[PDB]
């Protein structure tokens, strides 16, 4: 079972969390979309489009649940998966990192590198909001480890995760 679950939005820093927290922990990094693409030979868009969203989330769950079972290091969650009650369900006992942000904050990290992105019109940041909205409830839910994120350095970050994750020395009758 994995060391960590990582869950967030978008703007949480997600990709790069799970890759340093990976590197330093010395474990293998599953991330669940990669995977269903992998699986599939499909895009994430073409599942989508073809098999529609209900399908989308049945191999997204099968995909989670397989990697819940199967793998022992940092499983990085789609951003949709947690809508699934089956993912919500099978996370149960799992280790689940949730790196929280503000709705504020994920605004700013998403607008790329345009230096005025307000400038864009409001639609996306309107959008990103709604999708914070929806989304955190169920992220506070699953989660069992909440890390705020706000302004952190992601060194900082995977710091305070790993000081939660220690494992201690085994005893002589275990090895
Ligand atoms: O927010 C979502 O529901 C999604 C997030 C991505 O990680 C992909 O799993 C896909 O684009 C759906
Ligand atoms: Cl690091």
Avoid: C, W
């Avoid at 979309?33 to 489009?49: L, M, N, P």
């Amino acid at each position: 079972a994995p060391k960590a679950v990582l869950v967030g939005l978008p703007g949480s820093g997600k990709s790069t969390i799970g890759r340093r927290l990976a590197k330093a922990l010395g474990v293998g990094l599953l991330d669940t979309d990669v995977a269903i693409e992998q699986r599939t030979g499909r895009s994430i868009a073409d599942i989508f489009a073809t098999d529609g969203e209900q399908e989308f989330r049945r191999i997204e769950e099968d995909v989670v649940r397989a990697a819940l079972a199967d793998h022992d290091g940092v499983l990085s969650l789609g951003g949709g998966a947690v809508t699934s009650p089956g993912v919500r369900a099978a996370l149960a006992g799992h280790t689940v990192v949730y790196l929280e942000i503000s709705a504020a904050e994920g605004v700013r990290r998403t607008g790329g590198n345009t230096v005025r992105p307000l400038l864009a019109g409001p639609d996306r940041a309107e959008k990103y909001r709604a999708l914070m909205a929806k989304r955190a409830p169920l992220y506070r839910r699953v989660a069992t480890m909440r890390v705020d994120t706000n302004r952190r350095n992601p060194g900082a970050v995977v710091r305070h995760i790993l000081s939660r994750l220690q494992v201690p020395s085994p005893s002589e009758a275990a090895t």
